[model samples]
Target: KMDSVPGSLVVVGGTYEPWLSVLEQVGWKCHQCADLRKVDALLEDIGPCIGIVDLSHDEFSLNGIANLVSTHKHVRWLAFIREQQLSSDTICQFIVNFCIDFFTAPIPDAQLLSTIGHQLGMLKLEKKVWPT
Candidate 1:
């Protein structure tokens, strides 16, 4: 119930607006989840690839989320926070260390999609250097 076909990614809900359709348009197999617990299972079962963790919700503890990312070292997490969080929010400072990269927008999804594609393209290229 968390994902689509294969270019795997899991997005944990933050409740502003859904990016599921936007992501799928690019042909990514995006997955959806309402909380971290369900995503914990997705990462384990799905094994490898990226996951987007949204921090816009008011109900999570920073330390608790820390352990979640730390535990799943194999999954590359892409975190999302707003401009308010990005600006000197201590919690966000900690976030940067936890996830591979993040997207914060007072911007457009088109640009964000471009950024996502940028990462995706690089990941594909990066795969070439693996274990050769």
Candidate 2:
């Protein structure tokens, strides 16, 4: 029933058609924004415990992503990036510092579902332990 709440995920940055569709198929609610600029508003409105940042595009900045991750420490942020992008020192460092988990592009639907499900379970456990 909680999965039906319709706002468990805040998807930022690039668009992934299959990724979004899979999330819906699995019954996780999603709110999407093109970039970090609208993230604040979405966060306030959605109150999601999980965030997915698609780094498969060139429009994002390291600083901006870092700032967003740092600002929303409460949300477990997962990054989706091209395999080639991992070669960048900045991107690697950003993942180390900010993201809870990541997946390379052309992600497997099953793995993505499993990861988000794991994170969601953790979130629910956390809320039970620290009701806020």
Candidate 3:
């Protein structure tokens, strides 16, 4: 288990109950949204520096995801994707252009924690310099 960090993570798209539970259990704060439509409000309200986007879900749009990432360039975006989905050029491009990193399903807990922790550290360091 991990201790709580300073800021929350914004988790968008699909049924992330199980994943969210695990993250919370590990002491990471999270704000979840099922629809991307609510993302703007959530970001403004929560002001999270990290965001986890579930790209495995069919409901999300590639263009929309790209736009969202561009709009929130300051936030470090991470994607949860399936190996099969990587076959699509659009998905690959999006991941390359937008995400800081990604994890496949059946995600390894320790590594995921480490990755998020590392990103959080980087966000903090950047804030010191940029003060966003």
Candidate 4:
């Protein structure tokens, strides 16, 4: 049985301290990923949760995140990206095609918290049908 509520979240990215700190204040345990190399490892470590990928730093090819998505379909993924990165047609298309949602750069703390909470709630419902 799950010990916590269904809307818990895990953040996947190389550098997530800044945002993670904010989410932590809101009582969210945001698991920071050391590398995309260990996405499966991280997933195993933090089971059954929503995912937030901070693409603000290192850029990930669509294939990379796609592979992770293909492997872990149970988790809904939201990407944090800057406005500049969205100009790439491929990147924009890929995000639209694959990601559950995304937060544009310069995101206000309150908006981010509320958006994450809403995404988590949706994830909880999805988990009811297809649990990990």
Q: What TM-scores do the predictions have?
A: 0.73, 0.82, 0.84, 0.79
Q: lDDT by residue for model 3 over 1-132, one digit each (tens)?
A: 333374678887677645566677777678777666688766765544788888887867767767777777777898888888889898888888888898777766777777777786777655666545
lDDT of 4: 0.69
Better of 3 and 4 by lDDT: 3
TM-score of 3: 0.84
Query: Residue 61 of candidate 2: its Cα lDDT?
Result: 74
Error of 4 at 84 (Å): 0.3
Reference-based TM-score, model 1? 0.73
Supply candidate 1's per-residue lDDT for 86. 73
Model 4: residues >4 Å from true position, as ranges?
Answer: 1-7, 59-62
Residue-level lDDT for 112 in candidate 4: 77
Give per-residue CA lDDT, model 2, range 60-129, as digits (tens). 6766777787877778788888899889987878787888898876778888787787686667655565
The residue pairs that clash in candidate 4, if any, are: none
Off by over 4 Å in 3: 1-6, 129-132
Better of 1 and 3 by lDDT: 3
